Design a binder for this molecule. Structure first.
Ligand SMILES: [Cl-]
Ligand code: NI
Lengths: 211, 4
């Protein structure tokens, strides 16, 4: 049918999305999955949320990414309003007004990461790696576990993704370009790309690799 | 939830 998760809420807010669900015969879970069809976000006045994991895996799945107000209104008018007219435009980080999920919902015939071999390297925070990996898989990259697992050939296009903050290391991440032959960039590359569903490119994200 |  439908299936939901929420993000950014509070018990009372949540209780309220429940009310919605109960009434409308909608399924409501803790945890986003293949099958989750909606993602209800805390937003301000006019549909800017903050950037959370569910936020991204939201867009990645081309799921319905709608601001809490869908709910409270659909309650207030005692029926189900158009997800169509409630989508989240943007976010505090990536612009109040960037049509993210829009692009994404409709661009399912051409994922931003067509023909990419991505590899999330070294440790991340607030975001389990496997979830990051799940994310790019969702935009039709394909995941690599270790740098030396990169499909060689001119065939495809590899990229190493790191996030420098979670490191304690000096011989660390300036040095990936030695252990192979790929662009290296920050996780921000992926998130900003995914936010906008606009495949950013990498000038601004490159990490300086020791030759 | 964390944010980004
Ligand atoms: Cl939170
Ligand atoms: Ni090329």
């Amino acid at each position: 049918r439908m299936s939901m998760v929420v993000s950014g809420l509070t018990p009372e807010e949540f209780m309220l999305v429940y009310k919605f669900a109960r009434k409308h015969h909608i399924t409501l879970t803790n945890l986003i999955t293949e099958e989750t069809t909606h993602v209800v976000m805390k937003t301000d006045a006019e549909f800017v949320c903050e950037r959370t994991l569910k936020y991204f895996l939201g867009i990645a799945g081309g799921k319905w990414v709608v601001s809490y107000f869908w709910v409270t209104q659909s309650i207030k008018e005692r029926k189900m309003l158009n997800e169509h007219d409630f989508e989240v435009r943007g976010d505090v980080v990536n612009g109040r007004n960037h049509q993210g999920p829009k692009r994404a919902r409709e661009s399912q015939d051409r994922k931003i990461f067509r023909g990419l071999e991505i590899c999330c390297y070294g440790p991340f925070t607030n975001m389990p790696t496997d979830q990051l990996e799940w994310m790019v898989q969702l935009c039709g990259a394909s995941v690599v576990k270790e740098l030396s697992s990169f499909t060689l050939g001119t065939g495809v296009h590899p990229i190493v993704v790191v996030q420098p903050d979670a490191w304690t290391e000096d011989n660390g991440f300036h040095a990936i370009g030695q252990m192979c032959e790929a662009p290296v960039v920050t996780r921000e590359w992926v998130l900003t790309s995914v936010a906008l569903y606009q495949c950013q490119e990498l000038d601004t994200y490159l990490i300086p690799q020791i030759p | 939830s964390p944010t980004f």
